[PDB]
Symmetry: D2
């Protein structure tokens, strides 16, 4: 099977609905070994719990608050020490202050802006810099992004700008790391019911809109994202780097 | 194994270097059965011998000149008669008059322009129209495009405009066919030495630019395109339609 | 009137006073340009001839130019050459597809329908640039008009959408060819506007309605807004701009959902 | 004539070769009155001297270090009281630590990253929310971008990611401010020999490349940018917002 005997770091499991958890399962289903990380103590339990559901042999679960330089750096030392070699990292982390995800992007504070950039965009680069030390056989680094990073999506505001910065980081990191045998890609996922969609929008109204209008006439699932993540980490995706695959039932192609 | 139980139509094999022969090989390795179509009688011997290098039952090998509506139609009629159900088509077809592939694009004759449009872009639509009839369980339709459709490539000229037309075509067809359970996607391959590289303005130099400047520091293989085609035909890609995956060693990201 | 003072432009595709080409003709004229008009058919000849006539100064040459017809293309620019010697640019505002293709599924478009739309709506830019090349002696700009449907899927635009992708790639390749001859080539991507080429589209009114309420500028596009950006592209101000597609659509093109 | 009786804030003049100085000339030749900002004494005289060369008479030259919220606010507060109404702002500001404009982008420091983001991207939004306060007749906000925010440019690294973020901000800002009669647009300029090109590796080779491969066969001047800027601030451009106009001799259209 595609990922037999390879080991991957998964970052961003918060709960059962986490896109990261879809990715975890698809990779596990494809025969991967998994390392999870989680942000801060309010979660160790929900991630270990999930990790444990997976058939057989304990997955490492590590703390990694990506705003913290030394725990990020320690996280990957542990990985260097526990396992030696990984074959990729799935970066599934985003955060902005909730107040910034409503009315007028022009009103966002510089602290708001830089917090979003720091956690939603710069973290990929920080992670990629540690990941590099421990991917001596090469492989793929993946991030998740969203269409609001390319075109304007109401209320996505500062996150849109931080997705744009994320997608551009993908390209430049692809240009740095290719020579070291490492391919960097994104998945642009369609809107999905997650911890991170608990907010506003009348989210239901937007899913309904995807259902009526997306080419595939349905909304996307965390398993659809995770199967495209299996492709990207697999050998099938060798010649693919610097790319953004939309797993969104085709919505991204529409105009009016 | 991944495409177990499924049959695909591969159009465009002309010899062992054809990117279509790369896709055929990857699809067979992933358990598919194949039907091959070829441009005209002069190619029949090559295609029958390639097909027969693969283990398993024989493989239909049918003439299909995409310029000839009766031939196109009888071809897929024959396919419905003998197999009943397909799961996908790989369209790997292009042509323009070779004198239009030098000098200035502005000097392209009307006949020249419409011939390139006819064979290089409209054929995807005619193919799709007949494939929709035998795609009884849905599936994927793939074509092959090139960066000249997006950005100016010297001498690519009228093929450049026909690729843009092809890629717009993928969008519109994905929008049509989603609701019939059918996805439509393109692979944008980097340059590869094939028959359609014959006569190009120092292809060797082009190959060197890629090798030294592409994020991955190597040229694209027919096998790399074929493994991405596997993904796109597989159920891994069920959320992915109207997409153009660049398999070009990340070359497409580069500015200057 | 100054800014295009002392320059002459060919405007192709005026069919009545709502034509985008006529918004363009007025702006060019108000910027001091002299104008040559083309038409294709027998009768909307006057229509064009009568619109021309309203323009204040010297009378305008008005010439038949069916872009489907090589001889007529050659004769028209030939006649421009004999009559005025030098022109400074061309506005190409011309599209056609069979009406039955602009509904239903794109996958049912016939071969003839496809090639017809490419011929008139995409190739014709190139045929016109080739003729214009020989009369654009001091350089200048070639324009064309496109639509968002050439970049992303717009319901029912179908075959014209593909023909606009085709048009847009032609702008780039022609820009690459002609720059060394002092000629720039650019597109304006206009918002939906009420013209003859909008007659027969499902729900044109509700299209304009959701432009008004959702586009950043909260209003639909006008012919005059298109013509004023045309003035820029034909003027010296734009001398560093080529192979560009400028969206004059109240900002609509930036929106997802 | 074209900008008769309008006033514009021009930000970023550093010396006579500044793009922002090219824009002030064009705006002035089109009838505008101008207000200038600068950060820090290192160049107060330069901007004063330059502003004084101008043949109308007599421009406010105010301090505005976009890093400083109290100073930004004050600068636009001073403008509120002293001029009244403004019709536009040209934001020609960028900065990143020069140690980050070489080597691999992946080795970029946290605060290197957020510094570039803060000066080169966020400042637009900060400037735009002031300005909003003073553009009571509406008008245009312009920023300068570079192709490296769309595609990978060697060494541009953290600035390319910053420009991507800048360009996304343009889109979101335009969605915010359009309802207030305010347009927001970028100009993507070709390489120009300014202070911000000092130290770029092989800059003369970049220029020679542009001259020989760019469609217009020449390199890009400050006057070309200033004249496109005149268009964007004028009534001619009233239907244009959220646009990025490439003023780069057509270079942006080239593939390989
Ligand atoms: N509709 C959608 O849900 C879409 C989401 N995405 C992207 O998918 C990714 C995953 O989000 P999704 O699964 O939806 O939602 P989740 O909320 O489940 O996942 C987000 C994860 O990011 C983590 N995170 C936040 N801050 C930090 C930090 N300081 N250090 C380390 N980790 C942190 C969260 O941890 P914690 O719980 O501790 O805050 C959580 O585990 C995001 O990048 C998101 O934008 C893309 C397209 C569509
Ligand atoms: N560098 C490269 O090689 C790249 C190629 N591509 C694309 O890959 C695709 C395949 O090209 P490639 O494998 O390289 O070259 P090949 O020439 O081996 O394959 C192209 C196929 O198109 C067929 N074809 C041409 N005209 C017709 C027609 N009238 N009816 C039916 N088939 C026809 C050819 O047949 P015949 O020999 O009889 O003409 C040939 O079998 C093309 O669309 C090409 O543009 C994309 C990116 C890079
Ligand atoms: N919402 C909109 O209306 C938008 C339109 N556009 C584009 O703007 C351009 C102008 O269209 P618009 O003004 O809307 O509609 P009009 O119908 O007013 O203009 C279209 C013109 O194209 C001409 N034409 C068609 N076929 C030929 C041919 N064989 N040879 C010469 N001329 C021909 C028509 O002439 P005739 O009547 O004599 O056949 C007509 O004068 C087109 O390219 C269109 O696609 C772009 C964006 C939005
Ligand atoms: N090749 C090129 O020159 C191109 C440049 N650009 C862009 O054009 C814009 C203008 O750059 P250019 O004219 O070349 O170079 P300049 O160095 O002349 O202008 C850059 C300006 O940004 C100012 N700036 C830096 N930090 C701050 C800050 N803390 N607060 C307020 N102002 C600040 C600089 O001031 P100071 O010197 O005092 O630090 C300087 O005046 C930039 O956005 C740049 O990215 C775009 C495309 C091509
Ligand atoms: C699909 C979608 C999302 C979810 N998404 C794609 C994200 O990237 C969400 C990021 C996010 C980032 N930060 C957050 C939260 C969500 C929630 C609560 C919180 O405190 N901080 C989203 C988020 C905000 C506004 C609109 C949105 N749409 C239309
Ligand atoms: C990579 C590459 C190709 C090959 N390619 C991508 C194609 O799409 C080939 C198209 C093609 C299309 N028509 C053709 C021929 C080739 C050859 C001989 C012929 O008679 N007609 C190419 C083809 C022409 C010009 C430049 C080119 N570059 C840089
Ligand atoms: C804005 C818009 C147009 C107008 N447009 C951009 C066009 O390019 C029109 C092209 C055109 C092309 N060919 C045509 C006609 C119109 C009308 C009558 C005819 O007989 N042939 C349009 C046209 C069809 C479907 C949707 C459409 N939308 C949303
Ligand atoms: C054209 C071009 C530029 C200049 N540019 C477009 C910029 O946006 C420059 C931004 C900048 C940002 N921060 C800077 C400096 C320049 C210079 C000195 C310094 O100390 N900090 C550039 C800058 C670095 C690498 C390549 C570059 N190319 C190819």
């Amino acid at each position: 099977e595609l990922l037999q005997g390879k080991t991957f770091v998964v970052m961003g499991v918060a709960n059962q609905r986490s896109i990261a958890w879809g990715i975890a399962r698809s990779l596990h289903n494809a025969g991967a070994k998994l390392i999870f990380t989680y942000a801060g103590e309010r979660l160790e339990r929900n991630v270990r719990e999930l990790a444990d559901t997976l058939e057989g042999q304990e997955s490492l679960v590590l703390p990694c608050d990506v705003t913290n330089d030394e725990e990020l750096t320690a996280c990957f030392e542990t990985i260097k020490q526990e396992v030696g070699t990984i074959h990729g990292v799935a970066h599934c982390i985003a955060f902005a202050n909730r107040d910034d995800l409503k009315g007028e992007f022009v009103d966002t504070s510089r602290d708001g802006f830089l917090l979003a950039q720091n956690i939603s965009a710069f973290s990929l680069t920080a992670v990629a810099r540690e990941a590099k030390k421990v991917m001596t056989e090469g492989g793929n680094i993946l991030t998740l992004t969203y269409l609001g990073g390319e075109r304007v999506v109401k209320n996505y505001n500062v996150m849109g700008v931080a997705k744009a910065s994320l997608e551009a980081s993908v390209k430049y990191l692809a240009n740095d790391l290719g020579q070291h045998g490492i391919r960097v890609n994104a998945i642009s996922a369609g809107p999905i019911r997650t911890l991170s969609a608990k907010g506003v929008g009348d989210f239901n109204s937007i899913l309904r809109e995807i259902e009526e209008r997306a080419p595939l006439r349905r909304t996307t699932t965390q398993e659809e994202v995770g199967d495209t993540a299996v492709f990207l980490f697999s050998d099938l995706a060798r010649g693919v780097t610097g790319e953004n695959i939309h797993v969104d039932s085709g919505y991204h192609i529409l105009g009016l």
